[PDB]
Amino acid sequence: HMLSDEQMQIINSLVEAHHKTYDDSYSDFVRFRPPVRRLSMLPHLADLVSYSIQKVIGFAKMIPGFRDLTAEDQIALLKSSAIEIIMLRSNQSFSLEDMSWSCGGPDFKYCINDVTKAGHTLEHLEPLVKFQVGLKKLKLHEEEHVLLMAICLLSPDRPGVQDHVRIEALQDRLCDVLQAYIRIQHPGGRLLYAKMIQKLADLRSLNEEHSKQYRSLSFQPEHSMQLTPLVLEVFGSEV
Amino acid sequence: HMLSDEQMQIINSLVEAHHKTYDDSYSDFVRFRPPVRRLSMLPHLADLVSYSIQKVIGFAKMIPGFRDLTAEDQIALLKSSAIEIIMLRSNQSFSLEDMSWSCGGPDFKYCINDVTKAGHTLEHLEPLVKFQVGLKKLKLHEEEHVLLMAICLLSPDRPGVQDHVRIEALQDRLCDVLQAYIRIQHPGGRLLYAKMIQKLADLRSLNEEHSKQYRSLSFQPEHSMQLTPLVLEVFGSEV
Amino acid sequence: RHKILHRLLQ
Amino acid sequence: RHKILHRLLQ
Ligand SMILES: CC(C)(O)CCC[C@H](CC#CC(O)(C(F)(F)F)C(F)(F)F)[C@H]1CC[C@H]2/C(=C/C=C3C[C@@H](O)C[C@H](O)C3)CCC[C@]12C
Ligand SMILES: CC(C)(O)CCC[C@H](CC#CC(O)(C(F)(F)F)C(F)(F)F)[C@H]1CC[C@H]2/C(=C/C=C3C[C@@H](O)C[C@H](O)C3)CCC[C@]12C
């Protein structure tokens, strides 16, 4: 019936961490290789994703108890949750009005077609669009949005994690907060938490499809050369 | 006293190869990560150099007898001559008027300071500037400029070359052409060929200094992550 | 390996 | 290795 001085603390850190790592103007975008509308969008989106990974790392490092994990694990979690966290955070820029990520003028408004010119199929882009919409329809409070990201990241069931007990512990602690927060601060949240955990499962397959279509790219040098070192390292197999 | 039907042929291929691989407008430059004036120029120049390597490869593949070399050698030569060929071809964009490479508007005019913001020292940039000037003062015919590049590339004394006999053969054949061409087509070229071979030696040390300052970068991830896969592969040690 | 990720994780 | 250089050399 009332948040605790430690649960308030975690929410405060997470919300700040997100503000510290997510520009709502997308001003850094000019720094990317320009968009071209084969695979004309690959350089830009690769830049976009590489940049995002950095932001996702900055966020993670501020998640409570994350720093205390082994370098090995922090990497295991980041590598496997990378793309998911990116899909989650991109919801702030997605919009139902025109079914696209609107990160700026005509140049930075990303529609499903643009991503096609990055080597991904409309087939596996549909679930993404569908996922963004449902997430958008949840009208998540910043706290829940922020908590969902941190919970997604601290998933214990990722290829590579060692101490999956300390990680499961951290995660379902976060989960408590989300439930607690929703239950006492979000009117009509009766069903929300379940719906939110639904998203995580959605993300897994969304992650899966991507990791496949990415291997294609990563194997064709004419395309892999368009990627950034960070991307290649994060979505690479070399552990 | 008169060029031969085979020496004319080689000059024709080389000159075309260069036209095919060197835009005099530098229109592709917009595609690079924008210039910022630490290490603000690194992303742009890295893009610039990565792009150039591709052009240098396109040129090499058209050098007579180059394709017939082993993939192993073509790589051995390209890796070791990469930066030199780039320094040579950049002379077309360098200008004594303002002692810089002028590849476009204010954004693409590269002065020595800009390169400092890419992790290189003014100390080892001086010989480059000095080298460009002397080369510029030679007022090379396109043929000689083009021949010098091909000769530089086909140097037999590079770390990695196997069949250094077939390579030395190709090179001093090219050399003949340069001498022959200069001697019958370039009035006042009495001394030129020697001066041109001087440049090659200059290039070696210019290459050396760079390979050092590059290892620095390549070892600091915050910087190496700013490079492109192609650059990392070409200036890498992994043979 | 993961030179870059290590670096970025302070 | 040199995946990219190989590729670029047709
Ligand atoms: C079809 C599907 C889901 O399998 C593709 C998923 C990844 C795909 C882009 C890619 C890629 C690569 O595979 C890379 F290797 F990963 F690079 C590439 F193909 F190589 F490029 C999606 C994921 C989230 C989408 C977007 C997020 C928008 C953001 C803008 C802003 O909100 C900031 C957010 O962080 C991020 C818009 C563009 C398209 C994105 C980035
Ligand atoms: C000081 C010295 C000589 O040791 C530096 C030599 C390389 C240095 C740039 C670099 C680099 C990197 O080490 C990379 F790894 F190699 F990337 C980087 F630091 F990582 F970035 C020089 C070489 C030729 C110069 C230039 C050529 C201009 C051209 C424009 C046009 O003429 C097209 C030409 O091909 C090329 C202008 C910019 C500065 C350049 C590119």
PDB file of N, CA and C in Angstrom, chain A residues 57 61 74-75 78-79 229 233 238-239, chain C:
ATOM      1  N   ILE A  57      24.487   1.068 -22.818  1.00  0.00           N
ATOM      2  CA  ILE A  57      25.555   0.739 -21.879  1.00  0.00           C
ATOM      3  C   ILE A  57      25.598   1.748 -20.739  1.00  0.00           C
ATOM      4  N   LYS A  61      25.000   0.662 -16.766  1.00  0.00           N
ATOM      5  CA  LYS A  61      26.009   0.925 -15.744  1.00  0.00           C
ATOM      6  C   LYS A  61      25.423   1.632 -14.525  1.00  0.00           C
ATOM      7  N   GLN A  74      28.282  -8.637 -17.229  1.00  0.00           N
ATOM      8  CA  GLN A  74      27.826  -7.362 -17.774  1.00  0.00           C
ATOM      9  C   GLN A  74      27.840  -7.418 -19.297  1.00  0.00           C
ATOM     10  N   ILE A  75      28.862  -8.072 -19.836  1.00  0.00           N
ATOM     11  CA  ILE A  75      29.001  -8.248 -21.276  1.00  0.00           C
ATOM     12  C   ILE A  75      28.004  -9.276 -21.799  1.00  0.00           C
ATOM     13  N   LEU A  78      24.603  -7.505 -21.749  1.00  0.00           N
ATOM     14  CA  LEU A  78      24.543  -6.450 -22.753  1.00  0.00           C
ATOM     15  C   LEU A  78      24.462  -7.001 -24.176  1.00  0.00           C
ATOM     16  N   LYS A  79      25.291  -7.993 -24.479  1.00  0.00           N
ATOM     17  CA  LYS A  79      25.307  -8.589 -25.812  1.00  0.00           C
ATOM     18  C   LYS A  79      23.952  -9.183 -26.189  1.00  0.00           C
ATOM     19  N   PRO A 229      32.588  -1.063 -35.480  1.00  0.00           N
ATOM     20  CA  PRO A 229      33.282  -2.006 -34.599  1.00  0.00           C
ATOM     21  C   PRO A 229      32.431  -2.403 -33.395  1.00  0.00           C
ATOM     22  N   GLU A 233      31.086  -6.140 -32.502  1.00  0.00           N
ATOM     23  CA  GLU A 233      31.522  -6.751 -31.255  1.00  0.00           C
ATOM     24  C   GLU A 233      30.328  -7.234 -30.437  1.00  0.00           C
ATOM     25  N   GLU A 238      31.952 -13.995 -30.941  1.00  0.00           N
ATOM     26  CA  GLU A 238      33.267 -14.230 -30.354  1.00  0.00           C
ATOM     27  C   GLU A 238      33.339 -13.954 -28.853  1.00  0.00           C
ATOM     28  N   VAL A 239      32.961 -14.952 -28.060  1.00  0.00           N
ATOM     29  CA  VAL A 239      33.010 -14.853 -26.608  1.00  0.00           C
ATOM     30  C   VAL A 239      34.150 -15.706 -26.065  1.00  0.00           C
TER      31      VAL A 239
ATOM     32  N   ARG C   1      37.180 -11.844 -26.327  1.00  0.00           N
ATOM     33  CA  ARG C   1      37.889 -10.571 -26.355  1.00  0.00           C
ATOM     34  C   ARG C   1      37.009  -9.444 -25.827  1.00  0.00           C
ATOM     35  N   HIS C   2      36.406  -8.697 -26.749  1.00  0.00           N
ATOM     36  CA  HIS C   2      35.494  -7.605 -26.413  1.00  0.00           C
ATOM     37  C   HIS C   2      36.216  -6.368 -25.886  1.00  0.00           C
ATOM     38  N   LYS C   3      37.270  -5.957 -26.584  1.00  0.00           N
ATOM     39  CA  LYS C   3      38.053  -4.790 -26.192  1.00  0.00           C
ATOM     40  C   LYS C   3      37.181  -3.565 -25.926  1.00  0.00           C
ATOM     41  N   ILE C   4      36.242  -3.298 -26.829  1.00  0.00           N
ATOM     42  CA  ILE C   4      35.435  -2.082 -26.752  1.00  0.00           C
ATOM     43  C   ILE C   4      34.422  -2.085 -25.601  1.00  0.00           C
ATOM     44  N   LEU C   5      33.686  -3.182 -25.448  1.00  0.00           N
ATOM     45  CA  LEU C   5      32.711  -3.301 -24.366  1.00  0.00           C
ATOM     46  C   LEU C   5      33.369  -3.144 -22.998  1.00  0.00           C
ATOM     47  N   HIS C   6      34.514  -3.795 -22.816  1.00  0.00           N
ATOM     48  CA  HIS C   6      35.287  -3.655 -21.586  1.00  0.00           C
ATOM     49  C   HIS C   6      35.552  -2.183 -21.300  1.00  0.00           C
ATOM     50  N   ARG C   7      36.119  -1.502 -22.291  1.00  0.00           N
ATOM     51  CA  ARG C   7      36.433  -0.084 -22.193  1.00  0.00           C
ATOM     52  C   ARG C   7      35.208   0.728 -21.787  1.00  0.00           C
ATOM     53  N   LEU C   8      34.106   0.518 -22.501  1.00  0.00           N
ATOM     54  CA  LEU C   8      32.884   1.288 -22.287  1.00  0.00           C
ATOM     55  C   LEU C   8      32.256   1.036 -20.920  1.00  0.00           C
ATOM     56  N   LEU C   9      32.532  -0.130 -20.347  1.00  0.00           N
ATOM     57  CA  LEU C   9      32.063  -0.442 -19.003  1.00  0.00           C
ATOM     58  C   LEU C   9      33.046   0.110 -17.979  1.00  0.00           C
ATOM     59  N   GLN C  10      33.455   1.359 -18.191  1.00  0.00           N
ATOM     60  CA  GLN C  10      34.498   2.001 -17.393  1.00  0.00           C
ATOM     61  C   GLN C  10      35.531   1.010 -16.870  1.00  0.00           C
TER      62      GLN C  10
END
